[PDB]
Amino acid sequence: ILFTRIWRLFNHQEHKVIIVGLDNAGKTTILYQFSMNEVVHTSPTIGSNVEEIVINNTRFLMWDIGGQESLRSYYTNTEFVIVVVDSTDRERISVTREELYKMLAHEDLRKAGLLIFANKQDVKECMTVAEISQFLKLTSIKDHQWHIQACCALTGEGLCQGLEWMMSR
Numbered sequence: 515i516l517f518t519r520i521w522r523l524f525n526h527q528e529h530k531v532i533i534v535g536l537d538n539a540g541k542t543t544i545l546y547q548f549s550m551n552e553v554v555h556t557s558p559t560i561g562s563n564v565e566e567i568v569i570n571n572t573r574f575l576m577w578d579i580g581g582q583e584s585l586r587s588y589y590t591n592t593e594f595v596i597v598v599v600d601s602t603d604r605e606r607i608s609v610t611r612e613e614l615y616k617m618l619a620h621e622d623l624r625k626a627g628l629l630i631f632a633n634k635q636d637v638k639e640c641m642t643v644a645e646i647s648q649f650l651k652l653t654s655i656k657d658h659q660w661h662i663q664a665c666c667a668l669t670g671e672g673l674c675q676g677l678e679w680m681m682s683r
């Protein structure tokens with residue numbers, strides 16, 4: 515009920531939201547927790563791998579980064595960029611790092627707030643939130659409002675606190 519009330523309230527206005535990460539990060543699982551007892555509409559786009567998910571006033575644009583996406587490079591009007599990171603995939607974490615900086619470099623995202631969800635934190639020996647932040651060098655980003663939040667999309671633990679950081683903006 516507490517995550518709900520803040521969501522319902524967060525949606526007093528329409529928000530444009532990007533949610534990115536590597537395949538299997540937990541992006542879809544997260545938009546599902548967001549979708550409980552809500553009205554959902556999903557739609558592919560033209561000329562891109564982007565899926566548009568509308569959950570009651572919030573327009574999420576989502577896609578995977580990495581692979582053939584790396585070999586490509588909208589942002590405009592997006593209030594929030596959500597990067598979902600799989601806390602256990604140390605191997606490909608650097609791929610997310612390179613993409614994250616290529617996005618923030620575009621002037622269209624000048625005003626977008628940055629939310630990192632360190633997901634799959636229920637898994638043992640996963641990377642800490644402190645290691646994710648310093649690996650992604652989040653303190654070096656001075657032209658953007660940012661927050662990192664540990665979460666577990668399966669149960670939705672942490673997702674209300676990332677939403678509070680967003681609503682607070």
Ligand SMILES: Nc1nc2c(ncn2[C@@H]2O[C@H](COP(=O)(O)OP(=O)(O)O)[C@@H](O)[C@H]2O)c(=O)[nH]1
Pocket residue numbers: 535536537538539540541542543544633634635636637665666667668
């Ligand atoms: N153990 C664990 N698994 C998760 C978590 N979030 C998502 N998953 C699982 O990881 C898989 C991929 O997640 P998915 O949301 O499909 O990723 P997507 O490709 O980024 O949209 C799914 O099988 C989920 O069941 C989490 O916090 N912990």
